[PDB]
Write a protein that binds this ligand. Structure first.
Ligand SMILES: CC(C)CN(C[C@@H](O)[C@H](Cc1ccccc1)NC(=O)O[C@H]1CO[C@H]2OCC[C@H]21)S(=O)(=O)c1ccc(C(N)=O)cc1
Lengths: 99, 99
């Protein structure tokens, strides 16, 4: 799809067998999801954004279907206010910015 | 232009007579720039992101040229780690997401 930006670019994702909504976020390097149950082992990490930092669990090689496009990569899990799909996954689904 | 997302989508902006680089950020509702000198009146606001909230100064009707495309809108100024161009301005320069 082409998506205009008059509203938040929210899409449905399927991850770890669960359905969620997440924001297509070109300002995020990596994908960050609110606390949820995920299969893997994981590694502790810190990520920083606008108002400081949060602690996340880093899960590698996780499958996500983003509007019915499959991608596999790193997902960070933690106390983000919003599920964010970052460039690490956007590149796999062929997402570009056009102006 | 069309912009792929293998690297951060940084563009040059001209604002307040100054040249800066900023991230085209579909995950941001509003535009947030690091501390800089801007002409005019402004109103205190707080905005929240990944790790909490920062206090910003809200400037309305500010002119920005983003890759040589002119837009006028709200610009928030404050301790963001990176200059961010948000959807409030992305819509004016005709920016879309495509996959
Ligand atoms: C500040 C940018 C450069 C990085 N962020 C991505 C942004 O798009 C971030 C995504 C987001 C976070 C919290 C709530 C809602 C949206 N946008 C965001 O901070 O936007 C600000 C300004 O505009 C406002 O609307 C949304 C909340 C407000 S981030 O903090 O969420 C982030 C940081 C690090 C990483 C990482 N290590 O991969 C991933 C994402």
């Amino acid at each position: 799809p082409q998506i205009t930006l008059w509203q938040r670019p929210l899409v449905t994702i399927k991850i770890g067998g669960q359905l969620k909504e997440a924001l297509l976020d070109t300002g995020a390097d990596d994908t960050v999801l609110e606390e949820m149950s995920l299969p893997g082992r994981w590694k502790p990490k810190m990520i920083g954004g606008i108002g400081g930092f949060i602690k996340v669990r880093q899960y590698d090689q996780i499958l996500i279907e983003i509007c019915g496009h499959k991608a596999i990569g790193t997902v960070l899990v933690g106390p983000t206010p919003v599920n964010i799909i970052g460039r690490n996954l956007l590149t796999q689904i062929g997402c570009t910015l056009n102006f």
